[PDB]
Amino acid sequence: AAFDDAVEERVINEEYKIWKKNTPFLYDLVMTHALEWPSLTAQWLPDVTRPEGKDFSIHRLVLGTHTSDEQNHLVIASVQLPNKIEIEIKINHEGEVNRARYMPQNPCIIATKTPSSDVLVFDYTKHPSKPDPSGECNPDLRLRGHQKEGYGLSWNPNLSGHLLSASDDHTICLWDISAVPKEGKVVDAKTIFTGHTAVVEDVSWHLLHESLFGSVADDQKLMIWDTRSNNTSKPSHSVDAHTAEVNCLSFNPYSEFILATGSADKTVALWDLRNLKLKLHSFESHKDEIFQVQWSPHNETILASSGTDRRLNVWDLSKIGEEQSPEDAEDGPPELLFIHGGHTAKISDFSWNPNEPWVICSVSEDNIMQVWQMAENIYN
């Protein structure tokens, strides 16, 4: 018992040695940073500073902590990228930061998921950069509605202040904070959606249609919801998406009918909203549960996925069905563009840089943050 956890470490350490050796051929950029505590969350902020006549630019990241019995913080870090990684702000946070997402219409506004089931809202410019030594958490809003913690969190990019949240209590909560002064008010949910019968793992608004969002859960279902519908216990569409828990979904930012889901069944599924009866494709190479899937912000055929097998896989759906030499068919399907092997623990989250194509930040349970970019010859 618990012995196989010892040799898998030995094999992990050997494959990481090989990966370090090959980085000059596979990567145009690799930066590794160890955080004091692991982050469960990562997301690039949308703005960049390009200081006068210097060869780099400064990008920022929302991170959090996951401590054991120590004060937690919401974290803004800065990264220098060519055309250094420093913590810039820590805000006191009650419990670990399950997930933090900035508001598209105002990226100073950051929503977080707490273990106590509260969803918190910070305007990070309304807080000192060094946290209150009391440790007391002073969020700008507290959003009530859940009875248990959760993970999914999604701001509507077309209706400002309309925030979705998924929870282990089997529900999805909607808040509209748009006319609520950000002075520590408590806001209860406008609507709670109850279609799922199990933990709801993720939720996401459609990028174009202001009334449409999807949810995925441990009941193996993808549900498509319309906020214009009066029935909140039954979604517009409900699909048996996977043979196990569905942990994540992402709408394609360029293709309004396409989305992707990732699952404990170790696959990423591709979906067309016009016919949810037929899975479009199943991306298979992961060796364990997938927890994050994200489409590229620059390239409509590119998406990436990560999870417990410590790999981050980048997929190119324009390559589905192309011929391979049997030596090439070895490493996997043609639509597998790249496998990032730099992490040695479960990957907790990743984010594509919105301003520097092909740059990704990924964070893992062993406190590692990596900012990396695969070699340009790999995506031509």
Binding site: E36, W37, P38, L40, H66, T67, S68, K346, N367
Partner: peptide
């Protein structure tokens, strides 16, 4: 189930 039981400080 998602979160590890004992995160470590560095």
């Amino acid at each position: 189930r998602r979160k590890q039981e004992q995160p470590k400080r560095l």
